[PDB]
Design a binder for this molecule. Structure first.
Ligand SMILES: O=C(O)c1ccccc1O
Ligand SMILES: O=C(O)c1ccccc1O
Lengths: 207, 207
């Protein structure tokens, strides 16, 4: 298998967060390393497991607990939930006190586990004033920029939003779980030249 | 009556991801001064069984190019817009107006989400498809960090140009206009609060 020569198409399951986290650097990497490969990505919900066997999908990335049968996996990284708001929010502060967190208004994302973030808050007596609720993360960044709403966001998602949308963060005041993002491949392809190649490239660019 | 300034009702809205970061930002800013205690929730048109949910009253309004919704559904057109071509502000060699000849030549990111790609292929135009993603969240970053170009809806481009440092070109191929509509179920045509939300949209969106 020669990367610089290959015209193969690799297919990857990953979340939306995982999409705008992973792809940008990856594409930049590939531009110089494998200039003729093609990449396609899809969501873990449109389905998988079978597809990984069939060779329809090559790798998958996320907090996929479902996968644990004929599935090798390597941890890339963990990261924490953070609290994100516009740089000049009228009254938000870092580190945010849990007391203040209760008090402000939030946008919540329904969405990988995650999470069940909102479960832990509610059980700890903390009832957020939930002004908006969205299914996934695309609009989050703009929304914070144009309003005084705060959000509970995964750390590496925050990172890629701070500049474009002019927002900052705070360590999260509540006790929430760490986020363990993993790389998964089907055993049947453990010894596939090209697949191992992609695997290592990920491990390389992320860790 | 209804009273917006007093109401604590929750409105539920079906819309795409593009529609989410297009509509929500301005809407939330609008509501902040007009209805400060209302709550909004949004979901994807694939999410529930929308059609049924709109009858039920589980979803109040829906926004998009939803052709499925015919029959017991009133609808008003908000706007149309065209497909554009989008690339980073200093792309090494991309130009505006992009010639169809150059379009064929550069490398693209394609979004899976109404067959644009069908019409290209039928017109003999085989793009060099370096990446393919399911929806739009990562598009903006991706163009920023690479020399890839994309075929994007106009009003989506608008909200990306600043944050990610990209510009556009009128699209060199013949592609359909995009007709975005507002839909509500007949059963609720005469609902005070629903009519209120309807009008607010009609108001904030048009030209
Ligand atoms: O939550 C995920 O699945 C995830 C995936 C990739 C990068 C960051 C993430 O939070
Ligand atoms: O589908 C939508 O709701 C939409 C909204 C704004 C711009 C383009 C779109 O497709």
């Amino acid at each position: 298998f020669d990367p610089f020569a290959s015209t193969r198409t690799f297919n990857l399951a990953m979340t939306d967060i995982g999409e705008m986290y992973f792809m940008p650097p990856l594409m930049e990497a590939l531009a110089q390393r494998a200039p003729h490969i093609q990449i396609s990505t899809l969501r873990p919900n449109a389905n998988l497991k079978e597809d990984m066997e069939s060779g329809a999908v090559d790798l998958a990335l996320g907090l996929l607990p479902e996968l644990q049968t004929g599935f090798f996996q390597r941890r890339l990284f963990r990261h924490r939930y953070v609290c994100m708001f516009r740089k000049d929010h009228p009254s938000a502060k870092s580190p945010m006190s849990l007391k203040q967190f209760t008090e402000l208004e939030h946008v919540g994302v329904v969405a990988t586990g995650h999470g069940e973030v909102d479960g832990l808050l509610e059980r700890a007596g903390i009832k957020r004033r939930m002004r908006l609720v969205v299914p996934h993360f695309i609009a989050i960044g703009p929304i914070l920029h144009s309003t005084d709403l705060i959000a509970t966001v995964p750390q590496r998602f925050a990172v890629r939003c701070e500049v474009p949308f002019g927002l900052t963060t705070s360590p999260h005041p509540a006790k929430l779980p760490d986020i363990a993002i993993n790389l998964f491949w089907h055993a049947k392809y453990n010894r596939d030249p090209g697949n191992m190649w992609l695997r290592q490239l990920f491990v390389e660019l992320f860790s």
